[PDB]
Amino acid sequence: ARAKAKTRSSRAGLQFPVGRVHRLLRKGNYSERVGAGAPVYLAAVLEYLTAEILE
Amino acid sequence: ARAKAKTRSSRAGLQFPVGRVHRLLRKGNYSERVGAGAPVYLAAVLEYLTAEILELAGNAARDNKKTRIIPRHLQLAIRNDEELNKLLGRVTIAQGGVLPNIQAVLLPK
Amino acid sequence: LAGNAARDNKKTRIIPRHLQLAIRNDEELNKLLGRVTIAQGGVLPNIQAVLLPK
Amino acid sequence: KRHRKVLRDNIQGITKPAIRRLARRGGVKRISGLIYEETRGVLKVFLENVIRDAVTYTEHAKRKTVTAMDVVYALKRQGRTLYGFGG
Amino acid sequence: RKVLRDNIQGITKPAIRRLARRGGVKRISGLIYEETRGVLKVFLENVIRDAVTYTEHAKRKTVTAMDVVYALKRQGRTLYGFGG
Amino acid sequence: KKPHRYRPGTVALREIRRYQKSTELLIRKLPFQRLVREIAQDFKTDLRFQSSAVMALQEACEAYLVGLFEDTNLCAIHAKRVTIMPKDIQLARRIRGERA
Amino acid sequence: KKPHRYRPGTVALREIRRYQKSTELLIRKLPFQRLVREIAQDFKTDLRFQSSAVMALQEACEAYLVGLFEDTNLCAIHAKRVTIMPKDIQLARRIRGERA
Amino acid sequence: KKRKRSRKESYSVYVYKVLKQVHPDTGISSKAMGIMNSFVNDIFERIAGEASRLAHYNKRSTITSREIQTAVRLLLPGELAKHAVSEGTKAVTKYTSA
Amino acid sequence: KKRKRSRKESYSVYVYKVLKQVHPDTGISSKAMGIMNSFVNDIFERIAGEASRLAHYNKRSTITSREIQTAVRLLLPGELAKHAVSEGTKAVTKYTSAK
DNA sequence: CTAACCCTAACCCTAACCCTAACCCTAACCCTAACCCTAACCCTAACCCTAACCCTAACCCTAACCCTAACCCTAACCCTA
DNA sequence: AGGGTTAGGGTTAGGGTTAGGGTTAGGGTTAGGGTTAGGGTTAGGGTTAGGGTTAGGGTTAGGGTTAGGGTTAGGGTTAGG
């Protein structure tokens, strides 16, 4: 049952889909290997930009 | 057991490395699968462009009484060809000057 | 057109040479007066590429 | 020894003759007098955007020398495309 | 049916005047409408050629807003809202 | 006999403000649809455009025309003038790089 | 054509014709080499600029300055003038979209 | 014949959550949500392309945090780039600590 | 060098053969060869990126001759695109006839 | 790539003449701004229809994926055009 | 480049399916070409001053020819991503 699915967003403290960003980086033909902290960094940058624009 | 090994450039009739173009398309992270007719098409297009540019450069060099192609002749041919100037508009050739274009107002009385 | 050619030739008066130059330069004027030869006037210094020295 | 460092006098390093022939190549028949400062002011901002990009490109490889390939990649990204000086 | 001159005249003069007033023009010359119509027709021709090429590549016959946005972004004019 | 007629300038300025403080469109939709259909007829026949497609086309064309008019007005102001001229649009397209 | 004085405006047309048929650098290397490093001091100290980087930077700066001068000259003749001025470079750079 | 129509990935739920976090009294129009989606997608594609270009320039086959940080510092201007870099460093530090 | 050093890649022999075919008894310079190499690489990368984008837009995973032809028609200008497309179709036909 | 002289030799930079050209009125045009009212007009409103789109459903072919072996491409070296 | 194998993405196909087209029609909208007049535009003149012209004497840059110290990729390797 793979225990429980602890949300990566609740682990990152952000409000952006880190899993969808990782999938987009993997299936987007950008590189053969995709890091783990890179989706979190991109999600944080996008969240900051969205927060500034919305404010 | 390989009988003979005919080169892909000879079977294609072109003068461009089809094998290296295919390797660049495969290792360039452009796509997972790469069609076989695509490297040949790209090589043919690049060969036609190179032939046109070299013909224009040779014509400019022959008009300038020289034999070897210089970047000045290359820039002159590129700026003279309208399609080449429209294609390479944001490209600056090093060691090359512009065309001696003087306006009518700047001309002396 | 003749005055423009004369001003370009550093001359105040209009001559038949300037008239012929302006007529041959203007495409519409050359198409209209194609079978008209201006007296006391020469052609344009047009040298072909093959006639140029190598 | 070399007990002197590079000062800020290089901004005025471009001489009046230097910018007085750079303009005549473009077709300027009469160069203004106050243009000598505006040209140095414009050239100052242009040489700062490419240098920052080259430094950021060099710092990615943990290196300390700025090659021409980094300058070419910075110019291609800014908007230019230099052919020849580099690969 | 269908006239060629009826299309260039479709860009009416008061419409171009209102556009120039929205941009910030107080006085609009008379020879501006024809040049504006010509430039707009050339730009529309280029964009429609790009969209037709995209539709033919998609092996289709309907020009979609996504293809129009792609053709506009290919020239450096990114548009938001209409599409995704 | 005087209805206090507006002097050249009064209306122009307040119309500019009224059209700048709005978000609606100016060019009609059906003539633009007829235009883009006639233009598309010069490539592939039996074409079917979309509503959002022609809407985005009209929006982009109106934005480009606004930018061109702004550049033309700026060139006219620099030429110590207030009206626009075809030579101004020509110089604007030459500097912006649209001539090639 | 006395060697004492030449008509002003005639020697420049000779200079322009001679300078437009050569590809040699106009800015000098040693003064330009110190400007690149002075700028790089604020970003990070201890840098080893390659002998080919300064050449490319100078070749790009010269081309950019030549293009800007050509645009300023094109803007100059519009106002019935022939000389450039500091007020024309601003408009030439704003129309291009660099300072906007 | 059957249903199971395609699902369209959108960031509307995240944009609305950010809006509720910042201003918990304002709203967002349908157009505004689509504009924010296009902006996020464009910035994401630009940063991903810059990271891929850097990974292709330097002989490498993965994208670490340094590549994304360099792409951010190259794309974003001055204060925005510094703030984004600080937020990303704080996020990766919290991830490596928790 | 060759101190167990690496081997770089360029397109010099090909450009030389093209020059000899289009114009005999002529020469070229190293700067001109480098400029031609940079131009070829730039056009190659541009066409490859355009083909990849066109293949990703159509939800497909194969960049084929059709995608390359569309990228050429979209990048190259007027009659140059038609001539390049004609030569590419001829090369594809020759490849399909003999390999 | 940087650090340190060298030695001439082009570069630079003040420093008066000499136009000449660019800005300020200025008058004479001149052209677009400003109603305006009436005849296209198009954007609406529903509704068909229809032809291009679209969603399953195998399956089959073509590109990948390894060797290995020709094989070509790329470093070196002088020299001559 | 050849020689041999495999699996995953094209690819067709047909039954749904859907959005675009086409339809009248009509009525407020809108254009838009009238006429008119007021403000803006431009050469013309005018004048003076601001850079062209000159030019040579101090300034300083271009190879040139080295060592010597920074500095980096080449090889190997391995364990973690």
State whether the beta carbon of D12 lies below 7 angstroms from any atom of strand K. Answer: no
SS (H, E, C) chain F: CCCCCCCCCHHHHHHHHHHHCCCCCCCCCHHHHHHHHHHHCCCCCCCEECHHHHHHHHHHHHHHHHHHHHHHHHHHHHCCCCECCHHHHHHHHHHHCCCC
Is residue G9 within a helix (H) or strand (E), and if so which, with residue range? Answer: none
Residues spanned by the domain of D12: 4-87
Q: Distance (Å) from the C-alpha of residue F71 to the closest C-alpha of chain G?
A: 7
CA distances from D57 to A39, D52, D66, H80 (A): 21, 9, 9, 19
Distance CA B44, CA B14 (A): 7
β-pair type (F48-49, B68-69): unpaired
Structure token pair of residue G28: 């000098």
I chain contacts of residue B11, beta-carbon cutoff 8 Å: 95, 98-99
**Which residue blocks in chain B are alpha helix, DSSP H?**
8-12, 18-27, 37-63, 71-80, 82-87
Hey, CA dihedral for E49, E51, E57, E59, is it positive or negative?
Answer: negative
Q: Max CA-CA distance within chain I? A: 50
Q: Is the CB of B44 under 7 A from strand J?
A: no
Q: Do residues F47 and F41 lie in contact, with contact meaning Cβ atoms separated by under 8 Å?
A: yes
H1 found inside a domain: no
Phi and psi torsions of E79, nearest 5°: -115, 140
Rounded-to-integer distance, Cα G38 and Cα A19, Å: 46
Rg (alpha carbons) of chain F, rounded to whole number: 18
* 3 state SS of A19: helix
Please give the Cα distance from G26 to D18 (Å, whole number): 6
Instruction: Determine, for residues H58 and D61 on separate chains, whether the beta-carbon distance falls below 8 Å.
Output: yes
Any domain includes G67: yes
Domain around F80:
16-99
Dmax (CA) of chain A: 42
Range of the domain at H38: 12-97
Residue carrying the six token digits 């310079």: I29
Tokens of G68: 């800007």
At residue F69's C-alpha, the angle toward residues F64 and F73, to 5°, is 150
Task: Compute the nearest-CA separation of I74 from chain B (Å).
Answer: 11
Specify the experimental method: cryo-EM
Distance from CA of I68 to the nearest CA of A (A): 18
Q: Taking the domains of chain B in order of start, what are their residue ranges? A: 1-107
User: How many Å separate Cα I82 from the centre of its chain?
Assistant: 15
In CATH, the architecture of B1-107 is: Orthogonal Bundle (1.10)
> Domain total for chain H?
1
Residues 6 or more apart whose Cβ sits within 8 Å of residue E52:
E63, F40, F43, F44, F47
Residue F5: which residues within 8 A CB-CB, separation 6 or more?
none
Q: Which ranges constitute the DSSP H helices of chain H?
A: 12-22, 30-57, 65-75, 79-97
Query: What is the spatial distance, in angstroms and rounded to an integer, between the CA atom of G53 and the C1' atom of K20?
Result: 58
Number of folded domains that form chain D? 1
**Within-domain flag for F52:** yes
Cβ-count burial I6-41 (b if 16+ within 10 Å, e if not)? eeeeebeebbeebbeebbeebebeebbbbbbbbbbb
Q: Do B32 and A31 touch (CB under 8 A)?
A: no
Give the chain D residue whose CA is nearest to the CA of I9.
Answer: D87
What CATH number does the domain containing E25 carry?
Answer: 1.10.20.10
Whether F1 is covered by a domain: the verdict is no
Give the separation between CA I28 and CA F85, rounded to whole angstroms.
48
**Residue D43: both structure tokens together:** 């050239």
Element holding G14 (H helix, E strand):
helix G11-19
Nearest to B40 by CA among E55, I84, G64, H33: I84
Query: Mapping DSSP to helix (H, G, I), strand (E, B) and coil, where does residue G27 land?
Result: coil
Name the residue in chain I with its Cα closest to that of E50: I74
How far, in Å, are A25, E22, E45, F55, F96 from residue F67 at the CA level?
A: 36, 10, 19, 18, 11
To one decimal place, what's the resolution in Å? 11.0
User: Looking at the 3D structure of chain G, how many domains does it have?
Assistant: 1
Quote the tokens at residue D4: 């002197």
Give the separation between CA D17 and CA G15, rounded to whole angstroms: 13
Q: H helices of chain E, where?
A: 5-8, 13-23, 32-57, 65-74
Bases on strand K under 7 Å from any protein CB: 1-4, 8-11, 15-21, 30-33, 38-43, 50-55, 60-62, 70-75, 81
DSSP I22-74: HSTT-EE-HHHHHHHHHHHHHHHHHHHHHHHHHHHHTT--EE-HHHHHHHHHH
- Return the closest-CA partner of residue E36 out of E17, E55, E58, E63: E17
H93 in contact with chain A, both atoms CB, cutoff 8 A: no
d(CA E7, CA E16) in angstroms, rounded, equals 15
G7 belongs to a structural domain: no
Buried/exposed D57-87: b ≥16 CB within 10 Å, e otherwise: bbebeeeeebbbbbbbbbbbeeebbbbbbbe
Does nucleic acid strand K have an atom less than 7 angstroms from the CB of E15?
yes
CATH code of F29's domain? 1.10.20.10
Q: Is residue H36 assigned to a domain? A: yes
Three-class SS state of D65: strand
**Tokens found for residue A34:** 């995709």
In a domain, H3, yes or no: no
> Is residue F11 a part of any domain in this protein?
no
Residue the block writes with tokens 């290296």: B20
Q: Which chains does A contact via 3+ CB–CB distances below 8 A?
A: B, H, I
Chain H: residue nearest B30 by CA?
H52
Beta-carbon count within 10 A of G61 CB:
20
